[PDB]
RNA sequence: CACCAACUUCCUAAACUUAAAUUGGGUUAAUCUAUAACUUUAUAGAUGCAACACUGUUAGUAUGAGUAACAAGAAUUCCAAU
């Protein structure tokens, strides 16, 4: 993760990990509205 | 006139088409004079075309108000709250029908300069460029001239 | 030499609102202890001074009547006495000016 | 914990205020007459137990408000923010009066109280600081004196020059806040409850209560800090401009409990001193002061 | 001519509800046809802007300008009507919220010159307006600290966007 | 470049300056308290002090009489100078005149004004600036400092 | 008014304390000055020998006036009298912290009152233990010649036969025209000149359509720092600390001047035979005569000069 | 061994091919009248029918400019006084 200070950068890196653990990454598959079913 | 006017970004009212498409026009009002030359074309629109337009667009409520009137006027109201008013004074039937269709197709978003022809909330999939992308790392993270 | 162009209000507003042309605020204004009116620190109170001179004019007016004419100044010291006062031994041989009013408290 | 004492003491202080404020129902008008040399004969029609001498000054002009430190209600010194109680004649005292004896005492007492407030919060919460008394010293003495008893752990530590400089920094912080000197006349019982923990304060309250026919005792508050007072105090802490905590001297006969006297000097905004004059006075304020 | 400044003292607000801050009183006063230049009067009106009533009077009493006495007299009248008619409790509890000068109706006369030539002189009049607001003068202006200046600079950096692209 | 010059330029010229000053001096001797513009009163103060010195020289002095004759246009004042003012100021070596600034003139020229008088006159006392009493806060602290220094050597 | 007010030192002093304060301040000036009389007994900084290329500290003196001076050859020399009054070293900056090439010393003279001074200046002197001085000037001094701050400097620093440089502010003449400021000729008085007698002529040429920077025009003259180079020292008075300097010195009488050894190439190394750091009366190896003379000077009380 | 560069040309949509006196043609602002319309409209008939500019006319207000310039002998006990 990036940050203005080392503590801020480390804190941001913690969020980058949690996003990739809960499968909420920015490039995750888009939500599916296609189904008529 | 670009710097003398406002501008905005490309947008949709409520993510109009993501799940289902909703028509933004919700109400049309037509004011007529029963006997007035200028309202003739609007009168013919009511006789011939208003009923078909209403059936094609069942989500728009159409109000037709014949009353003593100097100029016929069309008022269009949208779901976002925008209101547009059009003078129909002495227009042919076709022009009024053509104009009425334009109101149905439009959204209430202001017609002003749009900065970009494209809007996306996910511009990147592989990561936005930053100065360290395409820079190789160094052993022990030693910056240049650092002795260690 | 005559102006080559009209001067805009934007330029003029900068000239006549420059700090150099503004009225300076004064820090030397104080209130008088005796009269309670305003004064400057280095200047005599105008209210109190106003009392003194108007009493002085009354005294000088009485002096004019006694002399009665020009070129009648005494060659001896002068003294002012108010109703209820009599010359003392030290006051002997001095011109006495008599005032109808009582001795002012501030005047001694 | 010390923070708890401030909270509980403040609560009792506020409770008494509301009780006395509620005690007076409706509005009753008292006629108070200006007896001062300036603007003579003015009569202020004030409300009983609510309006204060500062409110009377507000009617006249801002000069009265800025320059008046004390008021003479029926010949007795009154705090500018102490609510008036009955019809009377009022006169306002300033620092530059021909004989400002009463004003000098009030300024001296208030500055001593401000010394007590700084001392309490200066030390670490680990140590226990107990305020014993603020001796009444003449202004001629050259400094105002506050007596304090520190913890036995610091029984032989003496503040250095930087430590004393630190104390003045807190005092200047108090001045910048511009805190009004709140006033309460309260009966022994409540005063004892607010000061039950401090044995020194308790006995002082007993003395100052026996003195009066009733049990009324004067209480003053600066912000959270509260203290007993010998008499009227300054309206606000913004009056002080020059402030110094000169020195601390150990009272030699204090083996049972080491009492350390805190000394300092102050001057109001109205009477500022030049740089050199202030230094010379400060030096003479670093010498022991004996109450006489 | 318009005379709206005088009318402003006739506005009546509805009774305030118990749970609301007390509304400060406002008093509007003016003197219209003053034989004095508005350009000259601006400086006197400018100086007292924001000051308290007593502070404004003290400065005006020791100014040598003709307009100072005119402004002082208007200020005293405004003070009296504030307490007398507008339910202001303390005379001293007032400050100058607004003070400005305006043009009056002027008269045209002849300025004689050397060779039978003339010029059009103006006999100038001016108006003076004040609003007195109950309460202490609003706190003076506080300059930005260095940290405040730095904070604004960083916000500008953080607001940067990639321009003319997706 | 008017460095070192000890006079104001007043009136229609050097002679007019003397006559304007002489008229003020004549009024001062007669009434003992005079109002003039602050600059003119300051200009005349030096002459007022020196005139008393000539009066002290004595009645019989020829130079003093000529000086008194020139400066006092109203000739009844000359006996007053030698027999009233000079005897009064025998003890003093100087500082016979008291000059103080008065609030500016309310006459559309807003002149800076002063009051000049001879000390010891019979008129009501001027409202002079009175220094603070020793009982004030600052004075007492200084008084305490004075006592310690004096008593402790 | 809840507003700022102006104060001065006398505003709140009573008649009794008004005299006391003056005596108290005067007393402290004497105590502080006496405390600094003996520098050698107050941990003086190490004394170094003179070496070629050395520069000593200078003094600040007051300009007393002028008088005539005669030499054994009968020639008359107008001479200016410079008096050193309360000259002390105040501040030292090392070579690095001021200018890589050389170090600096600040020296002040002419004790002044403490009543109308900024607190910052008073704070500076309080730590130094001295009464305030009217003027501060900076002297470039080599490392070996550095002197501890608080050290008194005396007129015997300089010696007769030594050339010196004096710098001071020139007499201020106010706004002046081109004739007096720059010696412009002007225009003829008669023969039809219409309101042009003391005016500048043409400012420049028409081709450039502007006025060159630095063009000589009417403006304020005088009141500028100027230096006079190569003035001999004829005699020094030890009792009153008076230096006799050849010729004229910039400024008016009673004005402070800066005096330092001459920087002219001919007098490149004159400090060889002078008190190298400075002259210390505390040492008093030999008490100096009241007046020191240059050899050529004809002393008063000598026999009349006969050119035999 | 190329790239960049003009609405040149292509491309989506369209368009159908170039100083200025002069010449041909289609509309239109305003007001009145006829007949209507009835929050200011239609078809006809008319005209003192449209102004960023004539050192244009009248009025207003700026600029230069709060600039150039203008004015009362002194004190007092007071302007039909000393
Ligand atoms: Mg004329
Ligand atoms: Mg004009
Ligand atoms: Mg001069
Ligand atoms: Mg010569
Ligand atoms: Mg000059
Ligand atoms: Mg010539
Ligand atoms: Mg000529
Ligand atoms: Mg050019
Ligand atoms: Mg093309
Ligand atoms: Mg026309
Ligand atoms: Mg037009
Ligand atoms: Mg032209
Ligand atoms: Mg035109
Ligand atoms: Mg103008
Ligand atoms: Mg000009
Ligand atoms: Mg000019
Ligand atoms: Mg002029
Ligand atoms: Mg005249
Ligand atoms: Zn007064």
The secondary structure of B100-147 as a DSSP string is HHHHHH--SS--SEES-S---S---SS----TTTT----GGGPPTT--
> Chain centroid to CA E22: how far?
23
Q: How big is the CA angle at E86 (ends E84 and E92), to the nearest 5 degrees?
A: 70
What is the distance in angstroms between the CA of the first residue and the CA of the last residue of chain B?
Answer: 61
How many C-beta atoms surround the C-beta of residue F118 within 10 A? 22
Determine the Cα–Cα distance for residues G45 and G277; give it in Å rounded to an integer: 11
Tell me if G87 sits within 8 A of G107, measured CB to CB: yes
F49 touches strand H (CB under 7 A): no
Q: How far is the CA of E110 from the centre of ligand 17 (A)?
A: 21
Which nucleotides on chain H have any atom < 7 A from a protein Cβ?
A: 37-43, 60-64, 66, 68, 72-78, 82
Tell me if G237 sits within 8 A of G159, measured CB to CB: no
The torsion region of residue D178 among left (phi > 0), alpha (psi -120 to 50) and beta comes to left
Q: Which residues pair with F99 in a beta bridge?
A: F116
Q: How far is the CA of E121 from the centre of ligand 14 (A)?
A: 11
Determine the Cα–Cα distance for residues B142 and B115; give it in Å rounded to an integer: 44
C-alpha torsion angle, residues D61, D63, D66, D67 (rounded to 10): -130
Q: Is F27 helix (H, G, I), strand (E, B) or coil?
A: helix
Determine the Cα–Cα distance for residues F38 and F13; give it in Å rounded to an integer: 19
**Residue B86 CA to nucleotide H30 C1', Å?**
24
The secondary structure of chain G as a DSSP string is --S-----TTTT--HHHHHHHHHHHHHHHHHHHHHTS-STTS-PPPP----TT-----EEEEEEEEEEEEBTTS-EEEEEEEEE-SEEEEEEE-HHHH-TT-EEEEEEEEE--SSSS-HHHHHHHHHHTS--EEEEEEEEE-GGG---TT-EE-GGGS-TT-EEEEEEEPPP-EEE-HHHHH------SSSS--S-SS-----S-STT-S--TT---SEEE---EEEEEEEEEEEEETTTTEEEEES--SS-TT-EEEEEE---GGGSS-GGGS-SS---TTT-SSPPPSEEE-TTB--TTSPPP---
Pairing of strands E126-134, E94-103: antiparallel
- B77's enclosing H/E stretch is strand B73-78
Q: Which residues pair with E121 in a beta bridge?
A: E109
Q: Which nucleotide is nearest to F107 (CA to C1')?
A: H72
How many C-beta atoms surround the C-beta of residue B27 within 10 A? 15
Q: Which ligand is nearest to the CA of E114?
A: 1
**Residue B89 CA to nucleotide H49 C1', Å?**
25
Residue C61 CB contacts under 8 Å (≥ 6 apart), including other chains: none
Could you tell me where the DSSP H helices lie in chain F?
Answer: 14-31, 38-57, 62-71, 77-80, 86-88, 137-151
Q: Is C99 helix (H, G, I), strand (E, B) or coil?
A: strand
Which residues of C define the annotated binding site?
Answer: 32, 35, 45, 48
Determine the Cα–Cα distance for residues E62 and C27; give it in Å rounded to an integer: 11
Interchain contact E/D (3 or more Cβ pairs less than 8 Å): yes
Determine the Cα–Cα distance for residues E55 and E95; give it in Å rounded to an integer: 9
Residues preceding gaps in chain D (C to N > 2.5 Å): none
Determine the Cα–Cα distance for residues D221 and F135; give it in Å rounded to an integer: 29
For CA atoms D244, D246, D247, D252, give the dihedral sign. Answer: negative
Angle between helix F38-57 and helix F14-31 axes, rounded to 10 deg: 70
Chain G residues touching residue C26 (CB < 8 angstroms): none
| DSSP 8-state code for residue F128 | P
> Chain centroid to CA D76: how far?
17
Tell me if G107 sits within 8 A of G89, measured CB to CB: yes
Q: Which of A2, A27, A33 sits opposite B125 (nearest CB)?
A: A27
Q: Which of F79, F123, F127 sits opposite C56 (nearest CB)?
A: F123
Q: How far is the CA of C9 from the centre of ligand 18 (A)?
A: 40
Q: Is E16 helix (H, G, I), strand (E, B) or coil?
A: coil
Q: Is D170 helix (H, G, I), strand (E, B) or coil?
A: helix
Q: How far is the CA of F108 from the centre of ligand 17 (A)?
A: 18
Determine the Cα–Cα distance for residues G24 and D62; give it in Å rounded to an integer: 38
Determine the Cα–Cα distance for residues D228 and D220; give it in Å rounded to an integer: 6
Pairing of strands B61-66, B25-32: parallel
Residue D78 CB contacts under 8 Å (≥ 6 apart), including other chains: D53, D70, D71, D72, D84, D232
Determine the Cα–Cα distance for residues E160 and E144; give it in Å rounded to an integer: 23
Q: How big is the CA angle at E89 (ends E85 and E90), to the nearest 5 degrees?
A: 115
How many C-beta atoms surround the C-beta of residue D174 within 10 A? 21
- Please name which of G40, G45, G74 lies closest in space to residue G308, comparing C-alpha atoms: G74
Interface membership of E54 toward C (CB under 8 Å) = no
Q: How far is the CA of C5 from the centre of ligand 13 (A)?
A: 20
B90 touches strand H (CB under 7 A): yes
Determine the Cα–Cα distance for residues D132 and D38; give it in Å rounded to an integer: 43
User: Length of chain G in residues, anyone?
Assistant: 308
Within 1-40 of chain C, which residues have Cβ less than 7 Å from strand H? 2-3, 6-7, 9, 12, 15-16
Tell me if G104 sits within 8 A of G146, measured CB to CB: no
How many C-beta atoms surround the C-beta of residue D252 within 10 A? 8
Determine the Cα–Cα distance for residues B122 and B130; give it in Å rounded to an integer: 17
Tell me if D149 sits within 8 A of D164, measured CB to CB: no
Q: How big is the CA angle at E123 (ends E118 and E128), to the nearest 5 degrees?
A: 155
Chain B residues touching residue E160 (CB < 8 angstroms): none
Q: Is E75 helix (H, G, I), strand (E, B) or coil?
A: helix
- Please name which of C101, C106, C108, C83 lies closest in space to residue C35, comparing C-alpha atoms: C106
F44 touches strand H (CB under 7 A): no
- What is the SS3 assignment for G113-130? CCCCCCHHHHHHHHHHCC
Interface membership of E55 toward G (CB under 8 Å) = yes
Tell me if E39 sits within 8 A of C16, measured CB to CB: yes
Tell me if D138 sits within 8 A of F144, measured CB to CB: no
Q: How big is the CA angle at G244 (ends G240 and G248), to the nearest 5 degrees?
A: 130
The secondary structure of B30-76 as a DSSP string is EEE-SS-GGGHHHHHHHHHTHHHHHHH-TTSEEEEEE-S-SS-EEEE
- Integer CA distances (angstroms), F54 to D143, F31, F34, F89, G206, in order: 55, 19, 21, 12, 68
Q: Name every residue in E having a CB less than 8 A away from some CB of B.
A: 166
- Please name which of D150, D115, D152 lies closest in space to residue D129, comparing C-alpha atoms: D150
Q: Is D198 helix (H, G, I), strand (E, B) or coil?
A: coil
Tell me if D113 sits within 8 A of D215, measured CB to CB: no
How many Cα neighbours within 13 Å face the side chain of G116?
3
C57 touches strand H (CB under 7 A): yes
F121 touches strand H (CB under 7 A): no
| DSSP 8-state code for residue E115 | T
Tell me if E6 sits within 8 A of E30, measured CB to CB: yes
- Integer CA distances (angstroms), D135 to D168, D258, E147, F40, in order: 20, 16, 45, 59
Q: Which residues pair with G140 in a beta bridge?
A: G104
For CA atoms D218, D224, D225, D231, give the dihedral sign. Answer: negative
- Please name which of E37, E59, E62 lies closest in space to residue E48, comparing C-alpha atoms: E59
- Please name which of G251, G276, G120, G80 lies closest in space to residue G173, comparing C-alpha atoms: G251
Partners of chain D (3+ Cβ pairs below 8 A): C, E, F, G
Chain A residues touching residue B126 (CB < 8 angstroms): 27
- Nearest protein residue to nucleotide H71, judged by CA and C1' positions: F109
Q: How far is the CA of E120 from the centre of ligand 17 (A)?
A: 20
Q: Do C104 and F31 touch (CB under 8 A)?
A: no
Phi, psi of D122 (to 5 degrees): -70, -45
How many C-beta atoms surround the C-beta of residue G49 within 10 A? 7
Determine the Cα–Cα distance for residues D248 and D258; give it in Å rounded to an integer: 12
- Integer CA distances (angstroms), F111 to C17, F29, F107, F126, G114, in order: 27, 24, 8, 20, 35
How many C-beta atoms surround the C-beta of residue D271 within 10 A? 21
Q: Which nucleotide is nearest to C62 (CA to C1')?
A: H77
Partners of chain C (3+ Cβ pairs below 8 A): D, E, F, G
Determine the Cα–Cα distance for residues G287 and G299; give it in Å rounded to an integer: 20
For CA atoms G197, G198, G199, G203, give the dihedral sign. Answer: positive
Determine the Cα–Cα distance for residues G288 and G282; give it in Å rounded to an integer: 12
Determine the Cα–Cα distance for residues G105 and E73; give it in Å rounded to an integer: 61
Determine the Cα–Cα distance for residues D61 and E72; give it in Å rounded to an integer: 16
**Residue B10 CA to nucleotide H5 C1', Å?**
32
How many Cα neighbours within 13 Å face the side chain of D289?
29
The secondary structure of D134-162 as a DSSP string is -----GGGSSEEEEEE--GGGTT----HH
Q: Is A12 helix (H, G, I), strand (E, B) or coil?
A: helix
**Residue B90 CA to nucleotide H45 C1', Å?**
22
Which residues of C define the annotated binding site for Zn(2+)?
Answer: 32, 35, 45, 48
Determine the Cα–Cα distance for residues D33 and E165; give it in Å rounded to an integer: 79
- Please name which of G245, G226, G225, G223 lies closest in space to residue G235, comparing C-alpha atoms: G245
Residue D96 CB contacts under 8 Å (≥ 6 apart), including other chains: C33, D270, D271, F132, F136, G12
Q: Which nucleotide is nearest to C11 (CA to C1')?
A: H63
- Please name which of D153, D100, D104, D102 lies closest in space to residue D125, comparing C-alpha atoms: D153
> Chain centroid to CA D85: how far?
21
Determine the Cα–Cα distance for residues G98 and G102; give it in Å rounded to an integer: 8
* Experimental technique for the deposited model: cryo-EM
- Integer CA distances (angstroms), F30 to B126, C53, C73, C77, F153, in order: 106, 16, 8, 12, 53
How many C-beta atoms surround the C-beta of residue G7 within 10 A? 16
């Amino acid at each position: 993760g990036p940050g203005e200070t080392v503590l801020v950068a480390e804190e941001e890196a913690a969020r980058v990990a949690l996003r990739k653990l809960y499968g909420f990454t920015e490039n995750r598959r888009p939500w599916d509205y296609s189904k008529p079913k | 006139t670009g710097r003398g006017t406002s501008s905005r970004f490309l947008t949709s009212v409520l993510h109009n088409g993501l799940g289902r498409y909703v028509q933004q026009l919700q109400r049309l009002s037509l004011s007529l004079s029963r006997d007035a030359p200028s309202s003739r074309g609007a009168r013919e629109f009511v006789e011939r075309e208003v009923t078909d337009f209403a059936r094609r667009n069942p989500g728009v409520v159409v109000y037709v108000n014949p009353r003593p009137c100097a100029m016929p006027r069309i008022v269009a109201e949208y779901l976002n709250g925008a209101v547009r008013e059009e003078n129909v004074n002495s227009k042919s039937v076709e022009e009024i029908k053509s104009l009425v269709q334009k109101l149905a197709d439009q959204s209430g978003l202001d017609v002003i300069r749009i900065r970009k022809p494209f809007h996306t909330d996910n511009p990147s999939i592989q990561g936005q460029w930053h100065p360290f992308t395409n820079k190789r790392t160094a052993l022990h993270g030693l910056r240049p001239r650092e002795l260690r | 030499a005559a102006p080559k162009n009209r001067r805009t209000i934007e330029v003029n507003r900068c000239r006549r609102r420059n700090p150099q042309k503004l009225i300076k605020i004064k820090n030397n204004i104080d209130i008088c202890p005796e009269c309670g009116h305003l004064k400057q620190k280095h200047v005599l109170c105008g209210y109190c001074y106003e009392k003194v001179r108007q009493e002085t004019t009354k005294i000088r007016q009485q002096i004019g009547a006694q002399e009665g004419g020009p070129f009648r100044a005494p060659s001896v010291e002068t003294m002012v006495l108010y109703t209820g006062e009599k010359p003392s031994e030290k006051d002997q041989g001095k011109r006495i000016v008599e005032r109808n009013i009582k001795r002012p408290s501030w005047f001694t | 914990s010390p923070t708890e004492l401030t909270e509980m003491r403040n609560d009792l202080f506020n409770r008494e205020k509301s009780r006395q404020l509620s005690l007076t129902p409706r509005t009753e008008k008292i006629e108070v007459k200006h007896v001062g040399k300036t603007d003579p004969g003015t009569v202020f029609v004030m409300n009983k137990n609510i309006s204060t001498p500062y409110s009377c000054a507000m009617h006249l002009s801002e000069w009265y408000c800025s320059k008046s430190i004390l008021a003479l209600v029926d010949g007795q010194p009154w705090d500018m923010y102490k609510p008036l109680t009955k019809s009377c004649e009022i006169k306002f005292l300033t620092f530059k009066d021909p004989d400002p004896k009463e004003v000098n005492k009030a300024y001296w007492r208030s500055c001593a109280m401000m010394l007590g407030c700084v001392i309490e919060r200066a030390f670490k919460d680990d140590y226990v600081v107990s305020l014993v008394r603020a001796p009444e010293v003449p202004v001629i003495a050259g400094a105002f004196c506050y007596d304090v008893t520190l913890d036995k752990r610091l029984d032989e530590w003496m503040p250095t020059k930087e430590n004393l400089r630190s104390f003045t920094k807190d005092a200047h912080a108090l001045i910048y806040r511009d805190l009004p000197f709140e006033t309460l006349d309260v009966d022994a019982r409540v005063a004892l409850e607010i000061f039950q923990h401090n044995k020194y304060k308790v006995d002082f309250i007993e003395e100052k209560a026996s003195q009066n026919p009733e049990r009324i005792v004067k209480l003053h508050r600066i912000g959270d800090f509260i203290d007993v007072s010998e008499g009227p105090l300054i309206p606000r802490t913004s009056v002080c401009f020059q402030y110094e905590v000169s020195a601390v001297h150990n009272l030699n006969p204090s083996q049972p409990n080491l009492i350390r006297r805190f000394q300092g000097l102050s001057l109001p905004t109205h009477l500022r001193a030049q740089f050199t004059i202030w230094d010379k006075l400060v030096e003479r304020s670093r010498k022991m002061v004996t109450e006489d | 001519i318009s005379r709206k400044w005088e009318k402003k003292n006739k506005i009546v607000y509805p009774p305030q509800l118990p749970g609301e801050p007390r509304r400060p009183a406002e008093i509007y006063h003016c003197r219209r046809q003053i034989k004095y230049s508005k350009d000259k009067m601006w400086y006197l009106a400018k100086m007292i802007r924001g000051m308290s009533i007593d502070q404004a009077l003290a400065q005006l009493e020791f100014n040598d300008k003709k307009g100072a006495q005119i402004i002082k007299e208007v200020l005293l009248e405004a003070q009296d009507m504030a307490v007398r008619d507008h339910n202001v409790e303390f005379r001293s509890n007032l400050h100058i919220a607004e003070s400005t000068s305006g043009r009056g109706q002027c008269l045209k006369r002849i300025r004689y010159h050397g060779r039978g030539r003339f010029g059009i002189m103006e006999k100038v009049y001016c108006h003076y307006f004040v609003k007195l607001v109950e309460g202490p003068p609003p706190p003076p202006e506080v300059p930005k600290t260095a940290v405040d200046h730095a904070k604004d600079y960083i916000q500008q950096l953080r607001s940067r966007t990639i321009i003319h692209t997706l | 470049i008017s460095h070192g010059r000890v006079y104001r330029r007043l009136g229609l010229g050097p002679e007019s300056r003397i006559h304007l000053l002489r008229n003020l001096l004549t009024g001062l001797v007669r009434h003992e308290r005079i109002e003039a513009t602050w600059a003119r009163a300051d200009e005349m103060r030096g002459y007022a002090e020196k005139l008393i010195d000539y009066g002290k020289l004595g009645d019989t002095n020829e130079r003093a009489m000529r000086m008194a004759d020139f400066w006092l246009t109203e000739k009844d004042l000359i006996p007053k100078l030698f027999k009233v003012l000079a005897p009064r100021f025998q003890g003093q070596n100087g500082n016979y005149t008291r000059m103080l600034q008065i609030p500016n003139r309310k006459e559309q020229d807003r002149a800076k004004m002063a009051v000049i008088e001879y000390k010891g006159n019979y008129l009501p006392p001027l409202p002079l600036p009175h220094r603070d009493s020793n009982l004030t806060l600052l004075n007492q602290l200084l008084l305490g400092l004075q006592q310690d220094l004096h008593h402790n050597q | 008014l809840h507003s700022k007010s102006s104060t001065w030192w006398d505003e709140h002093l009573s008649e009794e304390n008004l005299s006391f304060v003056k005596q108290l301040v005067s007393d402290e000036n004497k105590t502080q000055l006496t405390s600094k009389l003996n520098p050698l007994k107050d941990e003086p900084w190490p004394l170094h020998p003179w070496e070629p290329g050395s520069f000593r500290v200078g003094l600040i003196a007051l300009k007393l006036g002028m008088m005539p001076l005669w030499t054994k050859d009968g020639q008359k020399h107008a001479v200016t009298l410079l008096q050193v009054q309360d000259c002390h070293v105040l501040k030292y900056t090392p070579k690095e912290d001021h200018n890589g090439k050389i170090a600096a010393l600040t020296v002040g003279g002419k004790t002044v009152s403490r009543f109308y001074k900024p607190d910052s200046r008073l704070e500076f002197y309080r730590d130094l233990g001295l009464p305030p001085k009217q003027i501060h000037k900076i002297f470039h001094v080599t490392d070996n010649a550095v002197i501890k701050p608080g050290t008194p400097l005396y007129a015997a620093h300089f010696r007769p036969g030594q050339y010196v440089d004096v710098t001071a502010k020139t007499i201020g003449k106010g706004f002046q025209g081109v004739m007096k400021r720059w010696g412009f000729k002007g225009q003829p008085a008669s023969h039809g000149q219409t309101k042009t007698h003391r005016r500048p002529g043409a400012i420049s040429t028409g081709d450039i359509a502007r006025v060159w920077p630095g063009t000589k025009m009417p403006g304020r003259m005088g009141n500028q720092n100027r230096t006079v180079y190569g003035l001999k020292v004829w005699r020094v008075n030890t009792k009153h600390n008076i230096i006799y300097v050849n010729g004229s010195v910039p400024g008016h009488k009673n004005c402070l001047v800066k005096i330092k050894d001459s920087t002219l190439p001919a007098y490149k190394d004159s400090c060889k035979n002078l008190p190298f750091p400075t002259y210390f009366p505390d040492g008093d190896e030999e008490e100096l005569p009241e007046d020191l003379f240059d050899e050529s000077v004809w002393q008063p009380s000598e026999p009349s000069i006969t050119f035999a």
